[PDB]
Amino acid sequence: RLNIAVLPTIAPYLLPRVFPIWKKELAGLEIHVSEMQTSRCLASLLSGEIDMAIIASKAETEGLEDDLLYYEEFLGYVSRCEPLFEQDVIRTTEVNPHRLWLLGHCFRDQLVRFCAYSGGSMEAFMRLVESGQGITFIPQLTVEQLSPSQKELVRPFGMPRPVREVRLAVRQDYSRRKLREQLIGLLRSAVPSDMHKLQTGQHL
Amino acid sequence: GRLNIAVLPTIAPYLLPRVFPIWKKELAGLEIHVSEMQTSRCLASLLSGEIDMAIIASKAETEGLEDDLLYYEEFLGYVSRCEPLFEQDVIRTTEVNPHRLWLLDEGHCFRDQLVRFCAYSGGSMEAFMRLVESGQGITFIPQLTVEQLSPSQKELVRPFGMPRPVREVRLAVRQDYSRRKLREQLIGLLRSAVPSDMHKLQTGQHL
Numbered sequence A: 001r002l003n004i005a006v007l008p009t010i011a012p013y014l015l016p017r018v019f020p021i022w023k024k025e026l027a028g029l030e031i032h033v034s035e036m037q038t039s040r041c042l043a044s045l046l047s048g049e050i051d052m053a054i055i056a057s058k059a060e061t062e063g064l065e066d067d068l069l070y071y072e073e074f075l076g077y078v079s080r081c082e083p084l085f086e087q088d089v090i091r092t093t094e095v096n097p098h099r100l101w102l103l104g105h106c107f108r109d110q111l112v113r114f115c116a117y118s119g120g121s122m123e124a125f126m127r128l129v130e131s132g133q134g135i136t137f138i139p140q141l142t143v144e145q146l147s148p149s150q151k152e153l154v155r156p157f158g159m160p161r162p163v164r165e166v167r168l169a170v171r172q173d174y175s176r177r178k179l180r181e182q183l184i185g186l187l188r189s190a191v192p193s194d195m196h197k198l199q200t201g202q203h204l
Numbered sequence B: 001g002r003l004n005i006a007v008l009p010t011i012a013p014y015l016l017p018r019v020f021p022i023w024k025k026e027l028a029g030l031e032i033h034v035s036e037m038q039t040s041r042c043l044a045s046l047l048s049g050e051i052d053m054a055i056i057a058s059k060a061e062t063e064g065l066e067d068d069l070l071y072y073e074e075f076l077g078y079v080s081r082c083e084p085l086f087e088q089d090v091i092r093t094t095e096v097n098p099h100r101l102w103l104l105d106e107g108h109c110f111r112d113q114l115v116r117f118c119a120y121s122g123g124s125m126e127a128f129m130r131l132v133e134s135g136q137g138i139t140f141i142p143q144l145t146v147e148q149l150s151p152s153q154k155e156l157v158r159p160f161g162m163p164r165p166v167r168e169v170r171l172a173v174r175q176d177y178s179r180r181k182l183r184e185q186l187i188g189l190l191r192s193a194v195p196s197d198m199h200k201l202q203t204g205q206h207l
Helices: A011-026 A038-047 A122-131 A178-190 B012-026 B039-048 B108-114 B125-134 B180-193
Strands: A003-006 A032-035 A052-055 A064-078 A135-139 A163-171 B005-007 B034-036 B053-056 B066-079 B138-142 B157-159 B164-173
Touching: A003 A011, A003 A038, A011 A032, A011 A178, A011 B125, A038 A052, A038 A064, A038 A163, A052 A178, A064 A122, A064 A178, A122 A135, A122 B012, A122 B125, A163 A178, B005 B012, B012 B034, B012 B180, B039 B053, B039 B108, B039 B164, B053 B180, B066 B125, B066 B180, B108 B138, B108 B164, B125 B138, B164 B180
Parallel strands: A003 A032, A003 A052, B005 B034, B005 B053
Antiparallel strands: A052 A163, A064 A135, A064 A163, B053 B164, B066 B138, B066 B157, B066 B164
16 A cells, blocks of 8 residues: 655546546555645654655655646736736736735745735635636646636746646655556546646746 | 634635635734644633634533534545445445545544544655546535535535434534623634534535
């Protein structure tokens, strides 16, 4: 049995894709997902309670390697009552500070960088925008798991458009290493190929 | 004024979007901060003094906490196309198998009310709803959610068999507090933010 870990910002979008692959390509191994924050993921890889983690960054912590899986682009999610609804692309510096939502843990880190509700959860903000009040950002992978009436309510970023990088982070002192290779290959296989090679116009 | 309301993850995404537009108007000039938090942490923060009120899922239960009733919220099945329950128009409480079910582990009033009334731990609400949409498993969900669902999501809900289970949203604060004038404003207001049908326990409703 192995135990993979995942961040709330990736889990609900990746997992629905990956689970079937775990049944076919591996064959019955007691795998289970465990949702956890980016900071606790790392600490738990070190502590030994967890064996593997799909995280949003590199580790940069002794005793942890981290191999890259794929790239996932941030996109604007702009509510109906905004002046941005008219534009077809998010100008990085034409937004309003008194209506954006964000989560400390990898989502604000990349977005607040250039930019009354803390401890949030993706869906809540995503719904506020659907309601017609505010803006929030979203991982590209998610936009296609939206109803058609939902999808019209997204807008791409303007080049150079910001992007995060999902990666699988593990501890150097790992026993079954054979697997780390297997799992890495499957996870990259879980998402389409089109967002695996950094194209022109992506600068973190 | 600098009230701090708390909400559970199972209420925040459904109730909050309702209140905020209403909260801009009636409570004019108040620097509020809403914060998603567990029910146990809610109470633990009610006592410490960092937050004044919590929209919670049960009675307050524990000396020093009052709780006024807000509303009642019914659970519904959320069943994937590849489940055998899709065939029924209602979930018989005891015709489901625990090999394709998901839930918010063993804590908080999604599990608190359901395992009592019944691999993926440390769960997250949204993850379960989308996973079922993919075609793998079942999870149950508070009625309020269904009101924000498109036609394709809505097609794959199946209610509970009567008596249908229901949880109880309430507003909880510690007595030692000045602005009761406001707190009340809040109880009636939150009640006003939601549809009318969820104020009176209807017929075929339990807990």
